[PDB]
Symmetry: D2
């Protein structure tokens, strides 16, 4: 939690700014270096606020709908993964990016990938 809260960057050059609340909330903004995106987007999510203390990561996830006051891609990404704490903090994720499609095109609505986030300071 104080762990998770901060600024993070992934391998694409994207920026994630997040605050982890005592109640398990994640709130912040996401800026993507790629895709049909510009500026910052709201994110919201959840994390395990009482994780195991036995060397395990802390499970978390968040969503961005790719609409802000400047652009709308008619799509949303969710990241699912875990925070790994300590001096070299990482958030390791897999994600699903679903675009709104017609029914005929639903088979090709969803991209899958993986992002690694590095905490800055």
């Amino acid at each position: 939690e104080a762990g998770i809260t901060g600024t993070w960057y992934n391998q694409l050059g994207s920026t994630f700014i997040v605050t982890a609340g005592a109640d398990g909330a994640l709130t912040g903004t996401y800026e993507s270096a790629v895709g049909n995106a510009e500026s910052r987007y709201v994110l919201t999510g959840r994390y395990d606020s009482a994780p195991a203390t036995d060397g395990s990561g802390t499970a978390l996830g968040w969503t961005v709908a790719w609409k802000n006051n400047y652009r709308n891609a008619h799509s949303a990404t969710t990241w699912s993964g875990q925070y790994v704490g300590g001096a070299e903090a990482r958030i390791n994720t897999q994600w699903l990016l679903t675009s709104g499609t017609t029914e005929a095109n639903a088979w090709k609505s969803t991209l899958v990938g993986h992002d690694t986030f590095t905490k800055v300071k």
Copy 2:
């Protein structure tokens, strides 16, 4: 609309409110897994979808900790709402468990849930 009480093919209950500007807020009760009672969820959806017949993109997260249990895991659902007479939310999901780094390869389950407002 998206706001309402939804059920998937497993009999899980997804109760959500869609805020006017894109928020999803609600509770999730899973019929399966290391879960009992309701869990907090939050997410986002496209609050100005295309007007060509396309569905409404969305996603949400549950961390599987509540007053009864903690599974040390979180699921995200990514999908789209399809309105009409038999409204549906079609999703794919990622369930990540906290693991050691070495077991990270087996940390994440993937699946697909379809939701309707029809009570089992």
Copy 3:
């Protein structure tokens, strides 16, 4: 058994032979996408599944090149066969397109196909 002609929810046709020791060999004809006619597939399945009621794990690949078209892409389906009166193959799939390194983030689609032997 697994050997036979299968159809998914999109109306794609999956014609396969399950070899006694685990091979899957056949053809795939997709009803959607950058595809026409039949494509070669190969895969593997568990040729000695558990006897507790569990399904039979399997997977296969199609590279979307044939004599008619080349989409510069490949799909893998990972899933399990569930026998019984209404045999089913339930899958999740990954469709990777060749991309530049920089566009690799958007190289891979994911979805789910369910197959039965019922002709549309």
Copy 4:
């Protein structure tokens, strides 16, 4: 193809030995450093045997059913990804590992991950 053919290792320490045939076939063996696995397992797959020449990767995929003459995990993995050629050849993949389950447990049948393979020589 001469590209793809060879020995590869991923970040877990697993070994993939493959031959790419002129007809788009992939054949070989896989040895996993992790999981319910020992020794070598057959793999088979397919690749785009006439890829684009415009800087793009070569699409491919393969499957392992985790039964060999020493062990059976009642599971199968498929890797989907692309080969990136040149002096520092890589195969970048995402994978799906489905275990056989009862119907009641099908929701938890499938793991998802990503592997990066480095060609040795």
